Amino acid sequence: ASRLLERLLPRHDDFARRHIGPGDKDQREMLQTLGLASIDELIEKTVPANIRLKRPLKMEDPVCENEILATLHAISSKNQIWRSYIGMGYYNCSVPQTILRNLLENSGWITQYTPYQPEVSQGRLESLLNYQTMVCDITGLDMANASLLDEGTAAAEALQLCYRHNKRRKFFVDPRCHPQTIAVVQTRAKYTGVLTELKLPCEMDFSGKDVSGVLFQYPDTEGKVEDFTELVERAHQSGSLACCATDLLALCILRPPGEFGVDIALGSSQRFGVPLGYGGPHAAFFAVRESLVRMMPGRMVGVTRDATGKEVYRLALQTREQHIRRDKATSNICTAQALLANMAAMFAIYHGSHGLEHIARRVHNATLILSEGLKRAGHQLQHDLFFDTLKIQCGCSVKEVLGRAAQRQINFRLFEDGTLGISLDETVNEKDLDDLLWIFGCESSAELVAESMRGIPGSVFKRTSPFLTHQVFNSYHSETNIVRYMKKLENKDISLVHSMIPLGSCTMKLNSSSELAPITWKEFANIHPFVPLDQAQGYQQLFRELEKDLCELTGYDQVCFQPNSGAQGEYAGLATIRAYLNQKGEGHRTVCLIPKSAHGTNPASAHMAGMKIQPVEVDKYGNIDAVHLKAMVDKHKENLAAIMITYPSTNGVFEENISDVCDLIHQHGGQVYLDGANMNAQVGICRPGDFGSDVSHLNLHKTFCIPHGGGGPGMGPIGVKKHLAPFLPNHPVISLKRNEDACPVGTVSAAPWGSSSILPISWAYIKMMGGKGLKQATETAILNANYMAKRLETHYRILFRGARGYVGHEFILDTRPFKKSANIEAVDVAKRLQDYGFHAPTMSWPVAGTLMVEPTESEDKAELDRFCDAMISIRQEIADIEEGRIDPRVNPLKMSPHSLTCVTSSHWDRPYSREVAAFPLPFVKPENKFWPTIARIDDIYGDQHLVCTCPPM
Amino acid sequence: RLLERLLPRHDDFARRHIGPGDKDQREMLQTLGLASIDELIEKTVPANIRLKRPLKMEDPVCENEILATLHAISSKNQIWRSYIGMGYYNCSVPQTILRNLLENSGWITQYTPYQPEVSQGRLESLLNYQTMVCDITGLDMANASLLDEGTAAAEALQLCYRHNKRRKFFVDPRCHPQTIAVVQTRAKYTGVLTELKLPCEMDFSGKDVSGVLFQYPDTEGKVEDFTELVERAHQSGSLACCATDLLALCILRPPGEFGVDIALGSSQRFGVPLGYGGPHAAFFAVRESLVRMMPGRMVGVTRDATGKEVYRLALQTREQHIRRDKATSNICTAQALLANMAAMFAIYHGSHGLEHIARRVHNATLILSEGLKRAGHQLQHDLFFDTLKIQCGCSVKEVLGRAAQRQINFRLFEDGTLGISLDETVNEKDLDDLLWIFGCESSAELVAESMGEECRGIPGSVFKRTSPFLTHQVFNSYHSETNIVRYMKKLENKDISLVHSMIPLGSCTMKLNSSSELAPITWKEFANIHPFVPLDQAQGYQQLFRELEKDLCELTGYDQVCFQPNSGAQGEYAGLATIRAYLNQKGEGHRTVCLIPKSAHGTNPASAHMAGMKIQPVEVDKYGNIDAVHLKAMVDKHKENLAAIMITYPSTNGVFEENISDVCDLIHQHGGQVYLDGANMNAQVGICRPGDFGSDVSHLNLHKTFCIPHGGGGPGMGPIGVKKHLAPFLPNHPVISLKRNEDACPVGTVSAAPWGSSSILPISWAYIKMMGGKGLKQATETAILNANYMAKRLETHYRILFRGARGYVGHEFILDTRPFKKSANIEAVDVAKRLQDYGFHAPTMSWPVAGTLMVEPTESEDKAELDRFCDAMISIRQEIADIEEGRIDPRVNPLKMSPHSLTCVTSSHWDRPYSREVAAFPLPFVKPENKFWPTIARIDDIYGDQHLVCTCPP
Numbered sequence A: 001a002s003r004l005l006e007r008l009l010p011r012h013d014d015f016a017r018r019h020i021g022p023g024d025k026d027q028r029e030m031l032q033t034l035g036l037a038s039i040d041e042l043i044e045k046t047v048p049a050n051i052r053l054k055r056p057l058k059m060e061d062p063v064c065e066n067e068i069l070a071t072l073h074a075i076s077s078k079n080q081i082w083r084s085y086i087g088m089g090y091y092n093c094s095v096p097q098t099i100l101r102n103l104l105e106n107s108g109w110i111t112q113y114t115p116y117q118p119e120v121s122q123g124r125l126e127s128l129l130n131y132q133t134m135v136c137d138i139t140g141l142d143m144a145n146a147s148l149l150d151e152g153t154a155a156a157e158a159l160q161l162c163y164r165h166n167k168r169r170k171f172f173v174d175p176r177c178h179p180q181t182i183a184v185v186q187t188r189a190k191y192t193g194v195l196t197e198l199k200l201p202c203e204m205d206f207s208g209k210d211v212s213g214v215l216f217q218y219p220d221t222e223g224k225v226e227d228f229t230e231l232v233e234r235a236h237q238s239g240s241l242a243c244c245a246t247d248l249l250a251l252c253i254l255r256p257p258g259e260f261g262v263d264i265a266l267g268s269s270q271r272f273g274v275p276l277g278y279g280g281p282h283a284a285f286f287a288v289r290e291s292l293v294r295m296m297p298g299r300m301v302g303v304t305r306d307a308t309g310k311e312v313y314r315l316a317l318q319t320r321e322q323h324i325r326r327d328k329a330t331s332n333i334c335t336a337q338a339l340l341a342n343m344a345a346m347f348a349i350y351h352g353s354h355g356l357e358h359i360a361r362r363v364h365n366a367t368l369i370l371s372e373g374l375k376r377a378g379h380q381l382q383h384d385l386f387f388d389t390l391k392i393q394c395g396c397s398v399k400e401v402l403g404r405a406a407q408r409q410i411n412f413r414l415f416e417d418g419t420l421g422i423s424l425d426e427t428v429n430e431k432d433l434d435d436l437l438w439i440f441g442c443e444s445s446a447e448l449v450a451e452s453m454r455g456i457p458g459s460v461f462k463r464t465s466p467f468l469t470h471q472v473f474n475s476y477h478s479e480t481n482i483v484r485y486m487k488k489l490e491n492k493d494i495s496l497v498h499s500m501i502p503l504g505s506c507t508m509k510l511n512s513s514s515e516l517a518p519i520t521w522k523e524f525a526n527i528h529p530f531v532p533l534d535q536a537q538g539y540q541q542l543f544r545e546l547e548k549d550l551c552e553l554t555g556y557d558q559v560c561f562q563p564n565s566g567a568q569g570e571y572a573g574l575a576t577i578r579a580y581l582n583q584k585g586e587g588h589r590t591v592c593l594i595p596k597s598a599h600g601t602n603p604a605s606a607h608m609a610g611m612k613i614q615p616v617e618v619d620k621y622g623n624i625d626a627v628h629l630k631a632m633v634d635k636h637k638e639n640l641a642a643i644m645i646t647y648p649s650t651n652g653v654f655e656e657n658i659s660d661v662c663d664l665i666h667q668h669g670g671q672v673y674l675d676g677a678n679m680n681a682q683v684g685i686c687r688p689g690d691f692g693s694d695v696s697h698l699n700l701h702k703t704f705c706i707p708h709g710g711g712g713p714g715m716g717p718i719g720v721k722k723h724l725a726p727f728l729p730n731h732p733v734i735s736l737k738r739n740e741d742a743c744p745v746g747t748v749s750a751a752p753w754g755s756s757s758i759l760p761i762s763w764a765y766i767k768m769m770g771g772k773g774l775k776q777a778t779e780t781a782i783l784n785a786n787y788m789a790k791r792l793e794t795h796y797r798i799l800f801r802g803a804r805g806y807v808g809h810e811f812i813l814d815t816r817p818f819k820k821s822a823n824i825e826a827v828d829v830a831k832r833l834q835d836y837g838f839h840a841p842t843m844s845w846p847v848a849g850t851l852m853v854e855p856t857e858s859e860d861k862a863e864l865d866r867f868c869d870a871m872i873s874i875r876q877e878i879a880d881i882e883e884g885r886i887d888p889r890v891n892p893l894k895m896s897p898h899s900l901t902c903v904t905s906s907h908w909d910r911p912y913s914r915e916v917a918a919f920p921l922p923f924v925k926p927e928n929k930f931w932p933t934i935a936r937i938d939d940i941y942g943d944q945h946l947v948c949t950c951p952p953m
Numbered sequence B: 001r002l003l004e005r006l007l008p009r010h011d012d013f014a015r016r017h018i019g020p021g022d023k024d025q026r027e028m029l030q031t032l033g034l035a036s037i038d039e040l041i042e043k044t045v046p047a048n049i050r051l052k053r054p055l056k057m058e059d060p061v062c063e064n065e066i067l068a069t070l071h072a073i074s075s076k077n078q079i080w081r082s083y084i085g086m087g088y089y090n091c092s093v094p095q096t097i098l099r100n101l102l103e104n105s106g107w108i109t110q111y112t113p114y115q116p117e118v119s120q121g122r123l124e125s126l127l128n129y130q131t132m133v134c135d136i137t138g139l140d141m142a143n144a145s146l147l148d149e150g151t152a153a154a155e156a157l158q159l160c161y162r163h164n165k166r167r168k169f170f171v172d173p174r175c176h177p178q179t180i181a182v183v184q185t186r187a188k189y190t191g192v193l194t195e196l197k198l199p200c201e202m203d204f205s206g207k208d209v210s211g212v213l214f215q216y217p218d219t220e221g222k223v224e225d226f227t228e229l230v231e232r233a234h235q236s237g238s239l240a241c242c243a244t245d246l247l248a249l250c251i252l253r254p255p256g257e258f259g260v261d262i263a264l265g266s267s268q269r270f271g272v273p274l275g276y277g278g279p280h281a282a283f284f285a286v287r288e289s290l291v292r293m294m295p296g297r298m299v300g301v302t303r304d305a306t307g308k309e310v311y312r313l314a315l316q317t318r319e320q321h322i323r324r325d326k327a328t329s330n331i332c333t334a335q336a337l338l339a340n341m342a343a344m345f346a347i348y349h350g351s352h353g354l355e356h357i358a359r360r361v362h363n364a365t366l367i368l369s370e371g372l373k374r375a376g377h378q379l380q381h382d383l384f385f386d387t388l389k390i391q392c393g394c395s396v397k398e399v400l401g402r403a404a405q406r407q408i409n410f411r412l413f414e415d416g417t418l419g420i421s422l423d424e425t426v427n428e429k430d431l432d433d434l435l436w437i438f439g440c441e442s443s444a445e446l447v448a449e450s451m452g453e454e455c456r457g458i459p460g461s462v463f464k465r466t467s468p469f470l471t472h473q474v475f476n477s478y479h480s481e482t483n484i485v486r487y488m489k490k491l492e493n494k495d496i497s498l499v500h501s502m503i504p505l506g507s508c509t510m511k512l513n514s515s516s517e518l519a520p521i522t523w524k525e526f527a528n529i530h531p532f533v534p535l536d537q538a539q540g541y542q543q544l545f546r547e548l549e550k551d552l553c554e555l556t557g558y559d560q561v562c563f564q565p566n567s568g569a570q571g572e573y574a575g576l577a578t579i580r581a582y583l584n585q586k587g588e589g590h591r592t593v594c595l596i597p598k599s600a601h602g603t604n605p606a607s608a609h610m611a612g613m614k615i616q617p618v619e620v621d622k623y624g625n626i627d628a629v630h631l632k633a634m635v636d637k638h639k640e641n642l643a644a645i646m647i648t649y650p651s652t653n654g655v656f657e658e659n660i661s662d663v664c665d666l667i668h669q670h671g672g673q674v675y676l677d678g679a680n681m682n683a684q685v686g687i688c689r690p691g692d693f694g695s696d697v698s699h700l701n702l703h704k705t706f707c708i709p710h711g712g713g714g715p716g717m718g719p720i721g722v723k724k725h726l727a728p729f730l731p732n733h734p735v736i737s738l739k740r741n742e743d744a745c746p747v748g749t750v751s752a753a754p755w756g757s758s759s760i761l762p763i764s765w766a767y768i769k770m771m772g773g774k775g776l777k778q779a780t781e782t783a784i785l786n787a788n789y790m791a792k793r794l795e796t797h798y799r800i801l802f803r804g805a806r807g808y809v810g811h812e813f814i815l816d817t818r819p820f821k822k823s824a825n826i827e828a829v830d831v832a833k834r835l836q837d838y839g840f841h842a843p844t845m846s847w848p849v850a851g852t853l854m855v856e857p858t859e860s861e862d863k864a865e866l867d868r869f870c871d872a873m874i875s876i877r878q879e880i881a882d883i884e885e886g887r888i889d890p891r892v893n894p895l896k897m898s899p900h901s902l903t904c905v906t907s908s909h910w911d912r913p914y915s916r917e918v919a920a921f922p923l924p925f926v927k928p929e930n931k932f933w934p935t936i937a938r939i940d941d942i943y944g945d946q947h948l949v950c951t952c953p954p
Ligand SMILES: *Cc1c(COP(=O)(O)O)cnc(C)c1O
Pocket: A333, A334, A335, A505, A506, A565, A566, A567, A568, A599, A601, A646, A650, A675, A677, A678, A699, A714, A715, A716
C-alpha cells in the first residue's frame, strides 16, 4: 500500500533502531530460547486480552532523528527572552560554562541514579556532601539534606517538621513570604489538618503555647532586610519553632539565620549557577538544628568507614525515608534534585567564599546605585535596607514607566497596590543600569549616580562570620582544576556509559543525546517562570503537544504538569480525589486501600494527603489477595475514598482481572489511583484509563527518558479522567484554570508547570518513536525481561509469574534460600556483582532478601547474556560454599567488592586468586574494568557516629 | 572611575586560564630568589627587543558576556540550503558522536599518540579509520588523515615524483577547481610540469609522465569508466591517482577494482559539519608496494612486552621528525579528531546504514533528474551519483530568482549551466522546493509514480558495486546508541589527557582549552555554512576574520594575516613560497638558498624542500645558540643566492638568543628574507613581537599558543603574518577571491578552502577577547615563571642543558638524561615510560637533543601540579641512583619494566625485586581514586615494522 516515493525514498532514519538495543537477530534468538514463534505470541501469553487496546495508538507520524531539533526549534523560537528583574524566588545568574559542559552535558554524571551502591558511587556522594557543607556554612545551621524539590515544598516540609516535633495544630505565616511559597504551605496544611494564619510579626501571639511554628522570609518578598531576633525569641519562649525562607547569595554578605536563633532555614539554590528553566529544575536547600535531625526529610549523606577502616561516604539515617518507614516516614519524597544540587556545589567550589562575596557585593551595589538614581528622579522607595530588591512607588504614572520598560524588553514585578518590584542579579551590568535609569526618567547615567554616592556593609546586619573554609572550596578555582575534580568524581561512579544498571522499578533506559540537547537552549533555559505569557508561547505549545500525546498513551482526558516528582504526583492525585469527594458532599470519605506490595511512596503520599490507610494483603502468588480485598472494601465501604494499585504489579506481574478490582472500588463510592511507574510494560499495548483507573502519575524520569541524574531531577505529571479535571492544581501567580467549574485542590509546586525546561526530553522521545516505535519499545522491554528469567530459572527461583508463566518488564530472583544453605545474603550477591562489572539490581523490595531485575528495551542480547552469565557464575560460587569446597567466612562473595587497593597489594591471604577476585569471567577485562573505589561499606557505623559535612582535609 | 569602584568587572577570564594565583606566584618567586615578575622578565627577555609601548587591544570581555558578544557576530551569517557540491556536502552529524566525542574534553585535549601505552584508545579509532578507507576505496593501506582534499591530491603528485622521478604530471580538468589550484601550486615550487588534459588527449607513450589525477565521480557529477585510462598509464610506467567520495563508493565499484594506485578525497560527509571549509579529515590510500612513500601518520598492529596484540604509529622514519628534508611530507599536526569522527560515523551506521544513505541520496537525485527533464531542462550526464549538470530550458535568471526565494544555493558554472549536488539531508519537501524552482508543475510523489521500480542509475549499470565492505566486527557491533556511547567511553578511558594531569610537552603548549572558547564551534551559524556560499551569506565570518586578524597583527607586529594555511607546517610552506614569489617578481628568482639551524623543528627543512629551496644547515654552538662563526660563513658562502633564514624565537631549547636583531640584519644585508617559526610565541605574547626585531613572516600555531584543542593529533590552524612588502604575494583561491588590490600577485593556493578550517577560529578569537592586553601578558609571564620554577627545583637532580645569558630559561627547558646511559644503562625512553606509573604523560622526547627530555608546563597549571611533576622526577632520580649504586638489579627494576599495566600489577605471578606498591603507587599523590592505568606493557617498536599490519586484525 505504500506510495512509490516512499519505496524509492524511505525515512532517513528510525530512532527506535537506536533506542531499542536488540535487533532482528537478537530478537529471533531470544524468542527461540523462550520456545515462541513471535513477539505477538509472547504478548498474547503475558498481557491479558480483555484490557488490551482495541485499536493502535493514534499518534503523529514519527519524526526522524535528523529532523527532531529543527522541529523543536520551530516551537522554542516562539518564546521571547527578555531581561526579567521580577525576582519572586528566581534570579538570573551566570552559569559557568565549564560546569554546564562537563557535568550537565556529561552522560557520566547524569545517567546513574540514587547512590544505592556506595562502593561504585563515591563521586556523587562526595559532591552532595559538598552541597550539604555549603548550605550549613552559609545558613549557619547544623545539618542539611541532599536537596528538596523547590522552595515552596521545602517551606511545607518545615511546617510538617514542626507538627511532627510538637504536635500543635496552629502555624503562623508572614504574608511577606513569596506568594507561591504561601500557596504551597497552605495546601500542605489544609490536607494535614493544621491551621495556618497569615500574620505580620506584630500580630503574632505565641502565648497560648498552641503554635507549632512560624515561617518568615529574610530578605522578604518586598526586598526588606529585617531583624527577627525578638520574633524568634518570642516563639521559643512559648515552645514554638522558627523557620526562615532565605537566599544563599544574600547570605554571603548578610548575617545568616543561624546567628539569630532560627531552627530551620530553607530556600532555593537556583541562583548558585543553575538556569531559570521556566520554573526548574532547581535544588532547594533545607537545614536544621542538630536536635531536629531525626525528623529531617529526604536524603542526607554521611561519613562512615569501609571494611578496611578507610573514611568513606554513604546515605545516612535511611530509616527516616519512605522506603523503610512508609506512612511513618518523614516525607513521601523519593526522587529529589540531586544533579542540580551538585551543580550548585560546583558553583560554590569554583567561586569560593571570596568569589561569592564579590558577586554578592556587586549585585547589592548595583541595586544601591539604582535606588539613588530613582530617588533623585522623584520616585519613592518603600524600604531603605535591602539586598537586591526594591519596592518602588512611581512619582509619575506607572503606565508610562512600563511603556518604557517594554520598549527595552525588561520585566518588573507588578504589585497589586500599583507599586513595582525590581530585583537585580549577577547578570546586571552598567548598560542594564543605564537602561533602568532611563526607564525611570532619571537624566543621570550609572557612572554619574555613583559619583554622588552604605546599605548592608554599613549596617548592623553585615555578615561577620566565615564560610566555605574547608579545602574543597579553596582548591579548584582554575578551569583546569575544576575540570579535573569533576572528572575524578565522575570516574568513581558506575553509570550507563559502562554497563546495564538493571534496577527494578527504575527503568534505566537510554537518555539520548538528541533528547538531551534542548534543555540547555537559551529559549528554554533562560525564561523567568512568571513572565507575561505572550513571552512563553513556545512553552505553551510544548505543553499542549506533550499533554495530548500523554493523554493518548494513558487513556486520560487531561494532564497537569505541576507535580515535580512521582511522589508529588501521588500526593497531588490523592488530594484531587479528596477535593472531588468534598465538592460532591462525600467529604467524610478518607480511607485509602493500599496493597502491601506498593512502593513506599504510596502510603507516605496518602498520609501526606490526610487519608487513613488500610493495607491490603498480597497472596502467595504475588497478587492482591482477593479474599482480603473484598473484606476490606466491605469494612470501609461507607468511608472509602480510594485504592492505590500498580499495573503491572511491583513484582513485574500482570494481575489477571484488574477491571474487576476497579469495578469493586467504584461500586462502593471510591476512586482508583493507579501508580504509573510501571508504564514501560504498557505503552502501546494497554492503557490504565481504559480499565477503570481515574488518575495516574507518570515518571518521565523512568518511562520517558528524563535522566536519572544521580537522584533527580524528575517529573511526575498526573493524568485524570474529566470528572477530576476541575479539581487539578492551580497557581497564584500564573493561572491554570481552563473551565467554568474550576475548584482547585490548591498548589503543590512552587512553579506552575514544575520543572518546565526538562519536558522537551519526553516530548522528543515520544515524537521520534511514534506509535509503532513506542509499542516496539514496550514489547522489547517485556521480551528482554522474560529472556533473562528463562535463562536464570534453573539456577534461581523466579519468585512470581503471571497466569501463563510469563513476567512483565521485570522479575524477582529469590536469593533467600541461600541464607540457610550457605550463609549468603542478598547484599553479598549485590556487592559481588560489582566485581563482574555490574551495579546491582533493586534490593529487598518488594520482597526482603531478594533481587528485582529490570533490563529495559535499550540493552541488547549480548549485554543481557553478560549479566545472566555473571549470575550463573555467582550461583556456582554459592554452590562451592554449599558443598564445602571453599571457606564459608572468607570467599569471594563475603569479601566483595574487591577494590584496586585489595587486588594490587603485596599481601594476599585469600583462598581464591586475584583473578577470581577481580576478573571472574573472560568478558571482565583490564580494558573495560571498572573498579569499586572502596571496600564493603559499613552501614551501622555511620548512623552511630553521625557526620554530615566534609571532614577535615 | 568611581563606577568601577562600586561596580567592578563581573569576572576576569585570566584568573581561570592561568593556574597559579597570588600565593603560588609569591612562593615560586621566593624559590627563585626574586622580588617580582618584572625582575624575572628583565633577567630573561633581552631589553632591546621588548615592546616599546604596551599592546593596544580592546578592553577585555568578561567570560559571562563572551558568547553573547560572539552571537552578535555569528548571527550575521545566513544558513541557506546549499546544493553547491564541489567537495563539501551537508550530512546529518549524529548528535551522540557530537556530544560524547567532539564536545568531550577526554577526547579533544590530548595530542599525537607519542606515548602508545597511555594512548591505545585513539590509536584503535584511527586504525578503524584506516580500515574503513581501505575497504571503501579497495586499496591496501591508508594513513591516519591528511589536511583536506586538494592537499591530499598534491601529496599524490609528490608521491608519484618520489616513485619514478618524472617531471610531467597529467590533471583531468574535471577535478574540482580548488583541487586543481592546490596541485598546480605544489607542482610549481617542486619543479614538476602539470598539464590539464582530458583522458583522450593524454599520451603516456613518451614514458615521461609521473602519473595522472582524475576524479570519480567528477566535478560535473559524471560516473566514468577509467579502466582503459589506468591501463594506458601503467603500460608506460605511470601511476594512476583517483580523487573520490566515500559515500558514492558505498554503491559504486571503487578505484581499487579498476587498478588505481592511489585513492584520496575528503571524509567530511561521513558525519562532520561543513564548517565553512573545515576542519575535515582527508583520506589517502595506496597499493602495498607504495607504502614506504606514504605521507603522514599511520597506525600499525604490533606486540607489547608480554606478546599481547596492541597499536602504535608505524613506519615512523617516513616522517618529518626523523627524516627532516628527506621525509615523505612536511605534515605534522593533521586532522586526527575528525578522522575519528568519520570512523565513528561508519561504525554507527555499518555498511547496511551507509548503503541506505547512499541509495537514498542517489534516488533523490534520480527523481530530481526525471522531473527536470519532463519540464524541458537538459542534463549533460545520464550516469551520476548525487550531482547534476543542468542546461536550463528557461531563463537562468528566473530559476535563480525562485531559488533565492527558498534560500537555496546552486553551483553556477562559467558556461551558464547549473550544478546541483544532493546530500543526506535531502527529503521530499526539499525535492518539491527544487521542482518548483525549475518550473516543473509536478511533485516528487508524482515523478516517482511515472518512474516505477525499474532499476536505473548506478544499480542498473555496469558500475554497481558488488564487493563487500566493513565486514570486521567493529563495524557490526555498535549500532544502538547505548553501545556507541559505551564504545566511545571505553576508548576515551584508555587515553591520558588534560582531564587527568599536566602533559608538559615541550614545543606543544598544552594549555587550557576553555569551555567558553569551545562552545561556538558547534553553533549552526558557524558549523553549517558551505565554504563557497555567496559572501552576503557569511558576513559574520567576515567580521570574525577582520577582528582576529587585527588582534594577531598587534600581537606579532605584522601588517596582514592570511588564514588559509591549515597547520603550522602549511604556514611554513606558504610563508616560504610567498618569499620566493616576492623574490621572483623583483628579479631575484635565482635566490633559493634557505639557512636552517640544526636545532629547527623537522617541519622547517621539510617545508623548505616542499617550497623548492636549497637547504643549508647552520650549526649550533656548545651553549645551544646558533653558532655565530658558522652562520657568518654560510651567509658569506651563499650571499648571491640567499633566499631566506628560518629562525625560532625563543629557541627550540627554550633559550632566548641574546642578539636576534643582529641575525635578522645580517640576512637582510645579503638580500634574504627572515622567516620566524612562531610555535614558541607563548614566551613572547605581550612582552616582545617578532615583527619589531626584523622578522618578515611567521606562522602561528593557534592549536598551541591560542587554545585550539590538540585533538589527539589535529585539527590545527597555522595562519601567517607578513610585513606589507610580502602582502601582495599571499595565497589566493580560485572560487572565493582573497585579493585586496589590483597589485595582487598571489603565490598560488595552499589549502582547499579560502580561510582553511574557518569554524575553529572562534576559539582563538575568544581567548584573545577575554584575556585582553593585560591578561595575554600575564599568561606569557606565568608560562615563563612556571618553567623557571621547575628548572630551579630540578637543577640539583638533573642537568638543565641550556640556559640564557643570565641563567634563565623561557617557557620550556631540557633535562639532560644522557649521563644515565653510562652510569646505569638507563635510556630517556625508560624515564618516559616510568613517568606513566607516576600518572604523567612524558614530556617531549629526544628533540631537539637526542636522549633528553624537554618540559613545557604552560601558564594553565598551578604550583601544586608543577610540584607533583618535579617530585615524580626527583623520585625517579633516586631510582636511578639505586641502579648506579648497586642497590637493585640493573636489568629488572621499575625503570626497565615500566610501564606497569593493570594486568601486570594484579596477577597471581609477581617475582620482581621490588613491590607492587613501588610499581603502581610510587608516591603518596598516586592513589587508587585517581590512578590512571597504562593499558599495555611497553611497546615493541621493531616488531610492528617487520610485520606490517595497518588495518583491524580479525
Ligand atoms: C520511582 C517510583 C515511584 C515514585 O517516583 P519518584 O519520582 O521517585 O518520587 C512510585 N512508585 C513506583 C513503583 C516507583 O518505581
